[PDB]
């Protein structure tokens, strides 16, 4: 604990948002009257992801099929070749 070169270092070389969010949540965990005001407010947001999720799922049902199509066009090769 000796400052030996500290003076030469000082010579040559001269958040709030989430804390407020945490205070808001600590106020939400006091009275029951806001909790239902959370719950249905949350319950619509879940629905916002369900309308998300099928829009992913109906894409995979597309993107599988061409690959399956890319396996029919090879298998109808063998319909000839084995019979050869």
């Amino acid at each position: 604990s000796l400052p030996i070169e500290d003076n030469y270092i000082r010579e040559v070389v001269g958040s709030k948002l989430m804390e407020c969010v945490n205070d808001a949540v600590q106020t939400l965990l006091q009275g029951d009257d806001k909790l239902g005001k959370v719950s249905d407010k949350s319950r619509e947001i879940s629905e916002k992801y369900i309308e998300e999720s099928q829009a992913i799922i109906q894409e995979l049902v597309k993107l599988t099929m061409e690959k399956l199509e890319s396996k029919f066009t090879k298998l109808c090769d063998l319909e000839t070749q084995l019979e050869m």
């Binding site: 000796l2 030996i4 070169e5 030469y8 270092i9 010579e11 040559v12 070389v13």
Partner: protein
Amino acid sequence: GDPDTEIRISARISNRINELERLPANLGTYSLDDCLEFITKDDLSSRMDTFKIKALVELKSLKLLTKQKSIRQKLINNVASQAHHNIPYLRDSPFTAAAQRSVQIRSKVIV
């Protein structure tokens, strides 16, 4: 880092070393508090060396710099080298406990 501004620090310390090493060795004080001691022709006052000790603490502390650096390396590379057995909020996290648990898995005995 940045060894441009590392040499510009290590060239100010050689200034201070080669300025302190040109002081005369017969350097001594005369404080305003020797009048209360009544120093005779030969009496050897007891505050004569309050500047020559101070002019050696600097000159030898600016030569023992790369010894306290090597002690601070051995301190930090043995306090931070554990870092998950002493600090409480790190050895109680999920992932650290899971990694320390998973490194200790003894290999499976076939038959």
